[PDB]
Write a protein that binds this ligand. Structure first.
Ligand SMILES: *OCCCCCCNc1c(NCCOCCO[C@H]2O[C@H](CO)[C@@H](O)[C@H](O)[C@@H]2O)c(=O)c1=O
Ligand SMILES: *OCCCCCCNc1c(NCCOCCO[C@H]2O[C@H](CO)[C@@H](O)[C@H](O)[C@@H]2O)c(=O)c1=O
Ligand SMILES: O=c1c(NCCCCCCO)c(NCCOCCO[C@H]2O[C@H](CO)[C@@H](O)[C@H](O)[C@@H]2O)c1=O
Ligand SMILES: O=c1c(NCCCCCCO)c(NCCOCCO[C@H]2O[C@H](CO)[C@@H](O)[C@H](O)[C@@H]2O)c1=O
Ligand SMILES: [Ca+2]
Ligand SMILES: [Ca+2]
Ligand SMILES: [Ca+2]
Ligand SMILES: [Ca+2]
Ligand SMILES: [Mn+2]
Ligand SMILES: [Mn+2]
Ligand SMILES: [Mn+2]
Ligand SMILES: [Mn+2]
Lengths: 233, 233, 233, 233
DNA sequence: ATAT
DNA sequence: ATAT
DNA sequence: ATAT
DNA sequence: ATAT
């Protein structure tokens, strides 16, 4: 199977697989069962911002998820990603729906990685996604160009989201996530998202993830698996 | 054939194909016969710096090449790259040798591209090249990892450059070089290089280039063709 | 008197002092009488974007001004700023009103300057202005904090722009704009602005400027003098 | 007195004031008596790199100090700088000598601060310091321009360092270090340094510091006080 | 930019 | 490096 | 770039 | 929202 590190914005509690009984953000290390979660007051139909940060000095993966008129949710986990990820990775966004549904609309995405050894750097910023975006690998249901946005999961022409959908967007270039020689390795990711449901239970969520370079949507990974994992282990 | 725009650091005069009688820098638009050249005092065995700049406002491709404690060489050509290049490109470095030879050593390479529509940006910086550099596509004789450098052309075990060699390195991700709705599109590239010849007459040169995404070394493009062009037309 | 280089967004034709008979952008080198102008369709009450660029290779000061869903206005002038400005400068925004008036609201301002000798760089970005913004020098009627915006000219309690007003904001740190040993010197500025007039004939305009470090609003430089020049010579 | 937060590279143990019995790096919060220290193998006459990082999510001030052929030293302290520093600060480098001496040579210094609320940013980079550097406030013995370096303390023409010297360099612009509205505030500082002594005990060290905007070298603050503190409390 |  |  |  |  793939190697996954992710930050999940989990809109739907799957009590049976160890989610808390509320919408939550979490840190996923090689399992959909988050090593750490925080309660998240997801605002149906509002544009939110996710900020993800890590550096090889603190070795602490942290995320903040926020809306304009509101308190942030934040979650952190101490993990040495040198011991988890391969040296070279792809970075991506992933989203899914199951019996329940939501738009998994990405309005912007930026990423920066640095190896300060003589610094190697990578930075990309998408504030507009276009119809034939050749620096993105789209997987499953993911599409670009609709209002300059990335729709990770299936949405109708009138803006109605579909169930049993899964989709991912990976940056085309492999990323040098860690290097043994590096004295400082850091990365940060920012995305803006619009999660909207007619349902009283939106599902299932959006994740920022880092994977082996050849990562693909695992078979059946709609619903609670967020397009990331082959099972709930 | 491929579409090529390039800045050549041409160490060897091929007067036969319209090079001036001296080492020169030039702007190449779909031909090895430069639309503009400037005289270049290439310093055998010294580390030089090439700076390349373009924006959609002035539509002027400019380059400056320098060594510490010496006058720069500079060349500029008015060209609308929207009318020359496809919307999506790859960017790369290329070098060749023929009957005469030189190290075509790259010590660092950086690149930035920006579309201000809401700005999309791409930036990479290599100050160290590693043995298995997965964000580079190496073509022909190009290798990485030797002293943390990119050797565009074949260098022997004893450090001797070889004749009739050609090699290129392209950044793995396609680049959105122009867009109809962009109000400002800009790019810049910087690389540092070490050209050393144990004989007199070094040959043949190093180029920064922009190509169609699927660009490959034209067969036989050693010597005066700089790994860029299938012929000297 | 001060040394001024500016890009004017001139909303009011002063044909008396050589303005064209229409709202225009221009390049001002030590005179309010622009060395080059382009026609500008200023959109009353809309948020616009000004982009300004210069490098020591082309020695061409260029500006583009745009609104969403409209054609840009662009203006360029060949000028060696090494021969005009002192080595160290301050950069700023300036605006004025006279018998006629307009809001001269700035929503965002960014600036980057680079001397590649070993690169020295300065970059600031304001997307929000605060009430006590200690990295800005406010001159004349300029205020910050009103809706997180910079109001270059006086606006009444009921939001009405006032006549005979002039105001400027300079970045607190002096900027190394050129250096003899630099092989490449470059700068760019971006600002977003909202010009609104409740009457017809808005006046008088907004400028990005570069000045001697100790620059101050010339006394009486309201109206057509744009807070930049002591007279119309 | 001033408010100080600093990272000290402390070359000289002052056992009487709570230094450990070896050259150390430490985190100083409003006292020369470090809240946390780590052992530091200072390499007399070699160029080192100091990296300092903080963000408002982890609220952990961390530093790494390294030389090319060697293991790094790293030190971290959990501290909410919102509760320690004023909202607006200056950032600087400081160094001192006493009975014992060392060159306190700074070869490069960079700084970035961001308030992600709509992001406000500041970035400067000095790879060359010039004789009349108007974006630096030099205090005490500090001088620029000698080989493009910043000498924080007195050095003779032949490169011999003097005792009882103290000097600081502050960036001219005030820095917005924290903001109540900000969802993420981050900063990072990098400097390259050359500490060289003929003595077997070099003294006294180099600090990166953040202070009230009007910070000045306290009276008598040579030797163990590093130009930062009025006393050893 | 529209009016005398 | 010198003082207890 | 220097030699025939 | 339905199953125990
Ligand atoms: O400051 C400039 C120095 C002057 C150099 C003058 C040229 N010297 C020279 C020539 N001229 C004919 C060019 O072709 C000769 C060989 O061609 C092969 O080698 C070159 C270099 O690798 C390459 O560009 C060609 O494509 C081909 O591979 C001589 O014959 C001679 O000597
Ligand atoms: O699309 C452009 C619209 C056409 C405007 C034509 C001018 N209208 C106009 C003039 N012309 C003379 C200019 O001076 C009049 C008043 O001058 C004062 O006000 C302006 C604006 O604040 C300022 O630039 C001057 O410096 C002075 O303060 C009229 O008299 C009239 O109406
Ligand atoms: O806390 C838990 C609930 N409550 C939600 C039930 C809906 C209430 C509002 C409608 O009346 C559950 N339910 C059991 C989990 O299984 C739900 C169905 O699973 C599918 O759908 C979800 C959402 O798309 C996916 O996560 C899942 O993979 C399945 O496809 C709790 O545990
Ligand atoms: O661990 C401690 C030492 N050892 C160093 C003594 C020199 C050994 C090599 C020479 O033979 C000390 N010494 C006592 C501390 O006082 C030293 C003198 O203080 C002045 O000089 C230092 C260095 O510039 C300053 O820090 C201080 O402020 C005074 O100006 C230990 O505690
Ligand atoms: Ca879930
Ligand atoms: Ca040639
Ligand atoms: Ca005017
Ligand atoms: Ca000490
Ligand atoms: Mn979960
Ligand atoms: Mn040529
Ligand atoms: Mn004008
Ligand atoms: Mn100490």
């Amino acid at each position: 199977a793939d190697t996954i590190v992710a930050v999940e914005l989990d809109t739907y509690p799957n009590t049976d697989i160890g989610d808390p009984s509320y919408p939550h953000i979490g840190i996923d290390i090689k399992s959909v069962r988050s090593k750490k979660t925080a309660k998240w007051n997801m605002q149906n139909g509002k544009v939110g911002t996710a900020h993800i940060i890590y550096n090889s000095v603190d070795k602490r993966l942290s995320a903040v998820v926020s809306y304009p008129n509101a308190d942030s949710a934040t979650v952190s986990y101490d993990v040495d990603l040198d011991n988890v990820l391969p040296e070279w990775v792809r970075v991506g966004l992933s989203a899914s729906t199951g019996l329940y549904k939501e738009t998994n609309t990405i309005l912007s995405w930026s990423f920066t990685s640095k190896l300060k050894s003589e610094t190697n750097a990578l930075h990309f910023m998408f504030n507009q996604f276009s119809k034939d975006q050749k620096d993105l690998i789209l997987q499953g249901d993911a599409t670009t160009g609709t209002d300059g946005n990335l729709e990770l999961t299936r949405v109708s022409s009138n803006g109605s989201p579909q169930g049993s959908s899964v989709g991912r967007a990976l940056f085309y270039a492999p990323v040098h996530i860690w290097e043994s020689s590096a004295v400082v390795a850091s990365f940060e990711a920012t995305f803006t998202f619009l999660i909207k449901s007619p349902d009283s239970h939106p599902a299932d969520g959006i994740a920022f993830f880092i994977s082996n370079i050849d990562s693909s949507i695992p078979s059946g990974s709609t619903g609670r698996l967020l397009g990331l994992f082959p099972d709930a282990n």
